[PDB]
Ligand binder design. Structure first.
Ligand SMILES: CCCCCCCCCCCCCCCCCC(=O)OC[C@H](COP(=O)(O)OCCN)OC(=O)CCCCCCCCCCCCCCCCC
Ligand code: SF4
Ligand code: SF4
Ligand code: SF4
Ligand code: SF4
Ligand code: SF4
Ligand code: FES
Lengths: 226, 208, 586, 180
């Protein structure tokens, strides 16, 4: 399959979607709700690009790269002004209800939402109204819960229910009061519930065992081990 | 509350041991007179290394007037100098030169590290910098700063004077004990912790 | 089109001339944000291209810079020839007011280039440094020895596989054998330095301990009686590894290291680095930022010139103007402490602006300094600078013309005392210097010590005029740009907005992400032309930081100008250059 | 040499002597440290302290931004948590023999806890005594920022501040609420 990103030709796999194909080529498209192991759902509306019908097209249309197949002879633009403005607007909408929590958050410096806020170029706040809040739940000894930081990307429920097969985590509520967690306070029963600390792009699910003696990612001495 | 040092030529070539203060009342008065004369006339070696030397010669100028302490003669020869101010970075090419100049100085001699470079290497944790001048020569006073302001150099001069004024050295090289006794004085951090912790309000940085 | 845009500069007439002379396939034109035409020339055509540029109708007469780059770790090398290492040559034509950057690609095994010294004599020290730090051999060099590190040093420090920090190495142990071995290495031998020695040529040692404010360094002198028949400066005693730290610190955290490049310059040293990083980031700073940075640059320029004039007068033999000039420096320091919070290394410029706004009451202190300075300057002239003993010590001592200044890369007052009107603030204006009315003083054609000192007095007066214009016209507006890459963001929005807090959090911890590009900024420093050449590989750290300083050129010009003079003439020439050893070694 | 040159030089030497004499008849420019205290501007970059909130608690949330923004790397700290859930430094040490007093840590602090105060008198006899622990840095007041509190801005719930009690925050709405 042949795609044209910003006037440059690329050879990709036609069975892949545009987001994973463009990330495999080294291009940067912001995304929240898509995971390679979980598939595409088109929820966060962050991976928007501008697709053109043919080569001699100027208008185009905003499509979602996770929901669009990378078929042969595709014409898309990432650095288009309208696509960049829409991605910055999506980051801004996610940032309207976000708590001022980065210094006291275990995801700080390891946060996908921080990286995508910086990548979209959104650094000026003009929202002046209140932010929604959520109470937290006790999820056991391993996972720490902080629902104020959620961006409603549905990664946790998709992984935990579709992939891991767990039963006790779900999404509850409505329009902007979506809650992600257990129906009641208790320990998460899945044997693979600890992957929520890497699945969640925010600091809603955090490593409590690490949060006891917490240090940032840049301060860690890492090794490859078994 | 004293340390005993004797030298006999890795650097530094000295061994120190914690010893009780030995201190006739005439010998004591002679010792205080010698210490007073040594501390009220301290001739620094005019040694230029880096920007900290620019601050040191700023301290020597008219708006600061380090001459008031009797520390202005500023000898160009290490034989005539009492104090070595390492005012700058200890570069690896300059470190044997510093060691040679310190060896060419004569007793009694004192060392002031001026700046973060001379203290520990400072911001220059790099291949061509010795991480502090205390790696190879013994230091009496340390000044944090990059650079210290000239009055910080004067404050270290006062600290050195107070350290000299209660140290014991032989009056003559034929009579007495020839080891050098230095006072184990209270650290300035623990002394100023009482007046530093109690600070509550400071002027806001939006004004002059 | 903004001034930071990526340009290939194919409209430059030098590109068309090179196309007509060497052919279209002979070289590759690279589009950069440096503002200069970058041409990748093949190695065997390098001397031909140098001769062609030297014999143009408006020739490229000055080798501005010559250094190397390790391209092994560089991932974003799109549109570039294949290379493990590279050597770049920055050449300036003053008549065209243009400049060109030639680049020679080298493989890892064949690290040899033909030498450039037959065209430009400053290539001697530039190629010695390139060999010292990168291991690139230059065939035909008169003496290719190390110039920064000692001769008994293993490895080349600026290679990417060389560990940067001292804590990586063993801690410094000074034993008796080590002290003897390093004292043996610093001993001078006539044959190794290319002295080329009559039964009367004695040898003189000047340093390395130096009783002056401008660093510590050595000069070895060949003497016939009192006449200097030959001399070669020994430098590297003040090497701080600032470029390796440029590869080791992030974009924001490197600014204190940019401060200590020329430690009498301060914000003047901060200016080209932040300008080049803003070119990399695509940031156009507002006008208030430009006026603030011009004001602080001129304040530190007056500070440096005051120290230089005082040190020159002290080296002549009058010891009172150093006291009064340091009092004037204390007045400048009062204003600088009020604005930035520090005296000599403020580290106050930022990517996108300045660290804080101007404090309330800065105009008052600037008024006191502007009222204080000119009477003190006139007293300095009447007391010491018009003294006939000082004139006899200074006039006609170590004099050179326009050709010797051009061939050695001398800039600043030494170049402009030869009659060449070339200031960066008027030829290639930066940071809104085109909005200020000031004059560029020039000499008659001969660069004496006295002519350079009087020229620096004239630039002190012109900087006072620029400071008066800054005081009268300072715009009301932001002290930081509204770009997303302004590092750090404005503090109050960081303290109450989550997106601004995220931007600040990632910019001060991991660093700001400059996209992969090359940028260049040259400014008129307090001692000449200071330039930053910054190569970014798309990361939060600089891939390459090249700092060109004029003191390197002036210390290299010393043996050509002091030859056949006295030792006291050498002392006066050292006092009248306006150098520092941090600028030389860095 | 010329006789006119000799006379002009003699007159210039006399003029220099005269000017230095009138400079002797001038006012002393010396600031008499230490009897005259040294004036410092409020934003002077001297001794580093950790400050407290107006409520009296220490402002540092142990977020390690100052340690990573330090170009020397002379700040070391460890996060600890109280039972209510607030973050604080378990310890906090600054190697002042390494610190270049550049103010980058204060610029990077999102709680205005770490500050550089107008104090330069920091001389020491031993280099081990230049390592200032949290006992030597935490002062009794707010310092240069008298009213800023980070925990009034944060979304995390601590003692005396539950969910929705922060600035620009609404009360939490349960998913079981009857309102649409
Ligand atoms: C071994 C030594 C042999 C030589 C000396 C023999 C004994 C002295 C014989 C008389 C000397 C007269 C000298 C000439 C006086 C008039 C000209 C003059 O002053 O020239 C010097 C200088 C010229 O000006 P210029 O350098 O061009 O600066 C630009 C400003 N127009 O103008 C100036 O600098 C300004 C005016 C300065 C005037 C200075 C005083 C002149 C008279 C001195 C008399 C004796 C004083 C003795 C000391 C008294 C104080 C302690
Ligand atoms: S989840 Fe990310 S953006 Fe939200 S408070 Fe934590 S670090 Fe900040
Ligand atoms: S809790 Fe995390 S993974 Fe789940 S929807 Fe919210 S942001 Fe996504
Ligand atoms: S401590 Fe700072 S001011 Fe002093 S020599 Fe080092 S770099 Fe210069
Ligand atoms: S002032 Fe600079 S060197 Fe000192 S602790 Fe803060 S960031 Fe580090
Ligand atoms: S940046 Fe401020 S709040 Fe964060 S660890 Fe440092 S002093 Fe504490
Ligand atoms: S990643 Fe495509 S819409 Fe979320």
């Amino acid at each position: 399959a042949t795609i044209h990103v910003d006037g440059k030709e690329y050879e990709v796999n036609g069975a892949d979607n545009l987001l994973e194909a463009c990330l495999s080529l080294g291009l940067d498209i912001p995304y929240f709700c898509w995971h390679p192991a979980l598939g595409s759902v088109g929820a966060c509306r962050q991976c928007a690009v501008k697709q053109y019908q043919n080569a001699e097209d100027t208008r185009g249309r905003l499509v979602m790269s996770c929901m669009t197949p990378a078929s042969d002879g595709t014409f898309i633009s990432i650095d288009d002004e309208e696509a960049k403005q829409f991605r910055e607007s999506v980051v801004e909408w996610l940032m309207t209800n976000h708590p001022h929590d980065c210094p006291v958050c275990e995801e700080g410096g390891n946060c996908h939402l921080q990286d995508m806020t910086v990548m979209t170029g959104h650094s000026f706040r003009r929202y002046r109204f209140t932010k929604r809040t959520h109470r937290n739940q006790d999820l056991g000894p391993f996972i720490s819960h902080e629902m104020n930081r959620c961006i409603a990307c549905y990664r946790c429920v998709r992984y935990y229910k579709d992939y891991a097969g767990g039963t006790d985590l779900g999404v509850y509520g409505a329009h902007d009061n979506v809650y992600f967690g257990r129906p009641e306070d208790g320990t998460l029963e899945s044997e693979f519930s600890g992957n929520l600390v890497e699945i969640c792009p925010t600091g809603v699910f955090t490593d409590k065992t690490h949060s006891e003696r917490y240090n940032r990612k840049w301060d860690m001495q890492f090794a490859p081990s078994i | 509350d004293y340390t005993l040092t004797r030298i006999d030529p890795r650097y530094p070539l000295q061994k120190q041991e914690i010893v009780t203060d030995p201190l006739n009342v005439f010998m004591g008065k002679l010792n205080d007179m010698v210490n007073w004369g040594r501390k009220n006339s301290i001739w620094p070696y005019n040694f230029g290394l880096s920007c900290c030397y620019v601050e040191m010669v700023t301290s020597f100028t008219a708006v600061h007037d380090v001459a008031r302490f009797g520390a202005e003669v500023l000898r160009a020869s290490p034989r005539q100098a009492d104090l070595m101010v390492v005012a700058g970075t200890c570069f690896t090419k300059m470190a044997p030169v510093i060691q040679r100049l310190y060896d060419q100085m004569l007793e009694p001699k004192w060392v002031i590290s001026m700046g973060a470079c001379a203290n520990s290497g400072g911001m220059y944790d790099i291949y061509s910098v010795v991480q502090g001048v205390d790696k190879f020569i013994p230091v009496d006073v340390y000044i944090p700063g990059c650079p210290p302001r000239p009055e910080a150099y004067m404050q270290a001069l006062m600290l050195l004077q107070e350290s000299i004024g209660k140290e014991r050295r032989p009056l003559s090289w034929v009579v007495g004990d020839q080891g050098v006794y230095r006072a184990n004085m209270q650290s300035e951090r623990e002394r100023k912790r009482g007046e530093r912790i109690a600070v509550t309000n400071l002027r806001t940085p939006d004004e002059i | 089109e903004p001034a930071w845009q990526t340009r290939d500069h194919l409209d430059d007439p030098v590109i068309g001339e090179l196309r007509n002379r060497f052919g279209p396939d002979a070289f590759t034109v690279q589009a950069t944000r440096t503002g200069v035409p970058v041409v990748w020339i093949k190695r065997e055509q390098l001397l031909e291209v140098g001769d062609f540029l030297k014999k143009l109708p408006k020739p490229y007469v000055m080798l501005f810079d010559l250094h190397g780059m390790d391209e092994r770790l560089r991932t974003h090398r799109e549109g570039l020839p294949a290379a493990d290492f590279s050597v770049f040559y920055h050449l300036i034509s003053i008549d065209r007011n243009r400049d060109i950057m030639l680049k020679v690609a080298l493989a890892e095994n064949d690290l040899h280039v033909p030498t450039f010294t037959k065209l430009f004599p400053n290539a001697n020290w530039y190629e010695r440094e390139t060999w010292d730090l990168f291991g690139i051999t230059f065939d035909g060099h008169p003496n290719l020895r190390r110039i920064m590190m000692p001769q008994t040093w293993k490895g080349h420090p600026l290679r990417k596989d060389y560990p940067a920090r001292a804590t990586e190495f063993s801690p410094f142990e000074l034993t008796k054998a080590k002290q003897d071995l390093e004292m043996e290495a610093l001993t001078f031998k006539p044959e190794e330095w290319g002295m080329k020695r009559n039964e009367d040529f004695m040898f003189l040692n000047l340093g390395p301990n130096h009783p002056s404010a401008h660093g510590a360094f050595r000069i070895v002198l060949q003497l016939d009686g009192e006449e200097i028949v030959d001399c070669v400066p020994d430098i590297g005693y003040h090497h701080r590894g600032a470029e390796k730290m440029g590869e080791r610190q992030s974009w924001h955290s490197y600014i204190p290291y940019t401060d200590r490049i020329e430690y009498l310059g301060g914000c003047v040293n901060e200016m080209p680095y932040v300008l080049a990083v803003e070119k990399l980031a695509g940031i156009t700073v507002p006008d208030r930022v430009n006026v603030i940075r011009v004001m602080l640059s001129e304040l530190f320029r007056i500070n440096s010139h005051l120290l230089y004039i005082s040190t020159f007068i002290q080296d002549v033999g009058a010891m009172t103007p150093v006291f009064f000039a340091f009092t004037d420096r204390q007045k400048i320091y009062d204003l600088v402490e009020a604005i930035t919070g520090f005296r000599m290394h403020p580290a106050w410029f930022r990517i996108g602006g300045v660290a804080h706004d101007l404090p309330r009451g800065w105009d008052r202190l600037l008024r006191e300094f502007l009222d204080w300075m000119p009477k003190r300057l006139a007293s300095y002239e009447k007391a010491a600078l018009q003294n006939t003993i000082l004139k006899g010590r200074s006039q006609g001592v170590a004099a050179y013309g326009a050709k010797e200044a051009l061939e050695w890369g001398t800039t600043g007052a030494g170049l402009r005392a030869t009659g060449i009107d070339f200031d960066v603030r008027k030829a290639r204006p930066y940071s809104g210097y085109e909005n200020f009315d000031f004059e560029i003083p020039v000499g008659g054609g001969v660069s004496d010590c006295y002519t350079r000192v009087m020229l620096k007095v004239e630039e002190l007066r012109q900087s006072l005029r620029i400071l008066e214009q800054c005081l009268n016209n300072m715009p009301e507006g932001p002290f930081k740009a509204d770009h997303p890459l302004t590092t750090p963001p404005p503090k109050e929005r960081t303290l109450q907005h989550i997106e601004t807090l995220i931007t600040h959090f990632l910019q001060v911890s991991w660093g700001p992400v400059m996209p992969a590009n090359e940028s260049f900024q040259m400014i008129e420093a307090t001692k000449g032309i200071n330039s930053y050449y910054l190569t970014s590989d798309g990361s939060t750290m600089s891939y390459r930081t090249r700092i060109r300083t004029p003191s390197y050129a002036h210390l290299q010009q010393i043996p050509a100008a002091i030859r056949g003079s006295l030792v006291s003439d050498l002392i006066v020439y050292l006092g009248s250059i306006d150098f520092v050893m941090s600028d030389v070694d860095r | 040499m010329t006789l006119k040159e000799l006379l002009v030089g003699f007159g210039t030497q006399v003029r220099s002597i005269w000017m230095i004499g009138l400079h002797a008849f001038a006012k002393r420019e010396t600031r008499m440290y230490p009897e005259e205290p040294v004036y410092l501007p409020p934003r002077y970059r001297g001794r580093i302290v950790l400050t407290r909130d107006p409520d009296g608690e220490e402002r540092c949330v142990a977020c390690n931004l100052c340690a990573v923004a330090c170009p020397v790397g002379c700040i070391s700290l460890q996060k600890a948590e109280t039972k209510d859930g607030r973050w604080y430094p378990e310890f906090f040490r600054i190697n002042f023999s390494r610190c270049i007093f550049c103010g980058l840590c204060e610029e990077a602090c999102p709680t205005t806890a770490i500050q550089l105060t107008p104090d330069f008198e920091m001389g020491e006899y031993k280099r081990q005594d230049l390592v200032y622990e949290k006992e030597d840095l935490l002062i009794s007041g707010p310092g240069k920022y008298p009213e800023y509190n980070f925990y009034r801005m944060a979304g995390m719930a601590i003692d005396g501040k539950d969910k929705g009690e922060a600035e620009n925050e609404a009360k939490p709405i349960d998913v079981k609420s009857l309102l649409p």
